[PDB]
Amino acid sequence: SDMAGRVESLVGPPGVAERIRELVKEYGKEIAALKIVDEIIDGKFGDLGSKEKYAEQAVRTALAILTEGVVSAPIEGIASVKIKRNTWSDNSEYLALYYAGPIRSSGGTAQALSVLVGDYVRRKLGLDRFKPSEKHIERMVEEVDLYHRTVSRLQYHPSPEEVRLAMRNIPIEITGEATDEVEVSHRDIPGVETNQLRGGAILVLAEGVLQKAKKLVKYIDKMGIEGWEWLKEFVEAKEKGEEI
């Protein structure tokens, strides 16, 4: 059983293996993943129903493709993919990825890609960006430091400023279940069902997007994806030793 075959049985949808083989040979893994996203959303594997069902299938299949079907991120790592609104703000629709505890079993590269995939899927679906309030931002700043010190040292420990930067710019909501019982300071935030620590979301953001930024930028180039200039500049600044 090859990569394409692993993907069909891991996440589906049924029939996707044949299409992946055909598209990978002609386009390479990265572009093939995005054309699969397009075909799923366009209904080539069935009318899936609600935008959310399209979103879930597209995220998981695309991420499976890009991680070669060798990690559990597309399955156990992501609890669910949800469409939500910026109620505090303009009530605009945006995508959210809920990461479960076992996202910690996928590396930072797969964690980073799930976010990039997230973005591409929400655009294809016509969704707006997540527009976290100030409280969402500060909640994450708080969670990152708290998890670092009292749950598990982060392989990449972003400064508070790095967390803000990532929060102001990442166009989907990185969030999840509570993975660890540690009550938080900034509590009852509109879109945040838990007042405990979101371990899955914390890793994906620190060890994923920020730690694997350079690697992610390369996928962004290989895929011709727009809208991530801020991550290009973040990488560039960190290598040069220029301030954020």
Cβ-proximal residues to 89 (8 Å cutoff; 6+ apart), any chain: 131, 133
Are the C-beta atoms of 110 and 73 separated by less than 8 Å?
yes
Phi-psi region of 32 (alpha: psi -120 to 50; beta: other; left: phi over 0): alpha
Cβ-proximal residues to 118 (8 Å cutoff; 6+ apart), any chain: 59, 81, 95, 97, 172
Type of residue numbered 117: V
Degrees, nearest 5: CA angle 206-144-175: 75
Cβ-proximal residues to 78 (8 Å cutoff; 6+ apart), any chain: 59, 60, 63, 97, 98, 99, 100, 103, 114
Type of residue numbered 173: E
Degrees, nearest 5: CA angle 204-207-210: 90
Are the C-beta atoms of 103 and 179 separated by less than 8 Å?
no
Q: After which residues is the chain broken (C to N over 2.5 A)?
A: none
Among residues 131, 130, 117, 108, which one has the least CA distance to residue 55? 117
For the chain, the DSSP string reads --HHHHHHHHH--TTHHHHHHHHHHHH-HHHHHHHHHHHHHHTTT---SSHHHHHHHHHHHHHHHHTTT-SSIIIIIEEEEEEEE-TTTT--EEEEEEE-GGGGGS-HHHHHHHHHHHHHHHHHTT-B-----HHHHHHHHHHHHHHHHHT---SS---HHHHHHHHHH-SSEEEE---B----SS---TT---SSB-HHHHHIIIIIIITTHHHHHHHHHHTT--S-HHHHHHHHHHHHT---
For tokens 């030793």, what's the residue? 241
Q: What is the largest CA-CA distance in the chain?
A: 51
